[PDB]
Design a protein around this ligand. Structure first.
Ligand SMILES: [Mg+2]
Ligand SMILES: [Mg+2]
Ligand SMILES: [Mg+2]
Ligand SMILES: [Mg+2]
Ligand SMILES: [Mg+2]
Lengths: 49, 49
């Protein structure tokens, strides 16, 4: 939403003027973060961990 | 309706003459009469009456 504003002075019996809320958006577009790793099965056998 | 009248004096065996009830109207057309006023909410509040 738009910021707060201030009311306007007006004459007695005169028309109240308009200043309503205005709207906008902030967008998101999530980015794929990725990470990978590969191990040979002989390494996977012989490792202590 | 038309006014009362007087009957015709006649000879014996003579034709009776006509003098039947004639009619008319008076029209009306009602005219719109109007009156109006405005008061402000501040005046309506503050007045002693
Ligand atoms: Mg206006
Ligand atoms: Mg404004
Ligand atoms: Mg005749
Ligand atoms: Mg007559
Ligand atoms: Mg007559």
């Amino acid at each position: 939403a738009s910021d707060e504003e201030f009311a306007r002075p007006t004459g007695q019996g005169a028309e109240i003027r308009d200043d309503g809320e205005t709207y906008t958006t902030v967008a998101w577009n999530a980015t794929k973060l990725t990470e990978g790793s590969r191990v040979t099965d002989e390494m996977r056998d012989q490792a202590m961990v």
